[PDB]
From a paper:
In our current work we have identified the outer membrane receptor responsible for ferredoxin and pectocin import in Pectobacterium spp., which we designate FusA. To understand the mechanism of ferredoxin import we have solved the crystal structure of FusA and two of its plant ferredoxin substrates, and using nuclear magnetic resonance (NMR)-driven molecular docking we have modelled the FusA–ferredoxin complex. The discovery of FusA demonstrates that, like their mammalian pathogenic counterparts, phytopathogenic bacteria can use a TBDR to specifically target iron-containing host proteins. In summary this study reports and the structural characterization of a TBDR receptor that binds to iron–sulphur cluster containing ferredoxin domains.
We solved the crystal structures of Arabidopsis ferredoxin isoform 2 and potato (Solanum tuberosum) ferredoxin isoform 1 (CAC38395) (Ferpot) and performed docking with extracellular portion of the FusA structure using the programme HADDOCK22. Docking solutions formed two major clusters in which the ferredoxins docked with the extracellular pocket of FusA, with the C terminus either pointing up and away from the FusA barrel or at right angles to it. The C-terminal up solution was favoured for both ferredoxins. In this solution, the ferredoxin molecule is positioned directly over the pore of the FusA barrel and forms extensive interactions with the β-wall formed by loops 4, 5 and 7, and the plug domain loop of FusA. To investigate this we tested purified leaf ferredoxins from potato isoform 1, maize (Zea mays) isoform 1 (ACG46956) and Arabidopsis isoform 2, which share 70–75% sequence identity, for their ability to enhance the growth of a panel of Pectobacterium isolates. Arabidopsis ferredoxin enhanced the growth of 14/17 strains, while potato ferredoxin enhanced 9/17 strains, with a noticeably weaker overall effect. Maize ferredoxin only enhanced one strain weakly, demonstrating that the discrete amino-acid sequence differences between the ferredoxins have a large effect on the ability of FusA to utilize the protein as a substrate. On the basis of our docking experiments, a number of the amino-acid differences between the three ferredoxins occur at the FusA–ferredoxin interface.
Author numbering: 2 to 99
Amino acid sequence: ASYKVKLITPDGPIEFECPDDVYILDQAEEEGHDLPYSCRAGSCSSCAGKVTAGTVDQSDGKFLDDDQEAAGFVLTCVAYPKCDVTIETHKEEELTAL
Ligand code: FES
């Protein structure tokens, strides 16, 4: 019901606990962290990250195709944690370089 989220940013790790019914980006902001975003609606690539451990539910978002979702990309503005999760943030360049 609350999961440990570790975010691997360009200048290192940050973790917090995040309820299973709160989006990861929302919770990160309640915790004082500043992450990239634009639409907050699952329809651009601005908030993109990559899951390196655990799983998320991001079915509220529509931007990613199945090859991107398969490579672990995630839209942090519309993603709920489903277990303890590790997510490397600021992945817009890499996603949009696929
Ligand atoms: S800010 Fe656009 S998909 Fe997250």
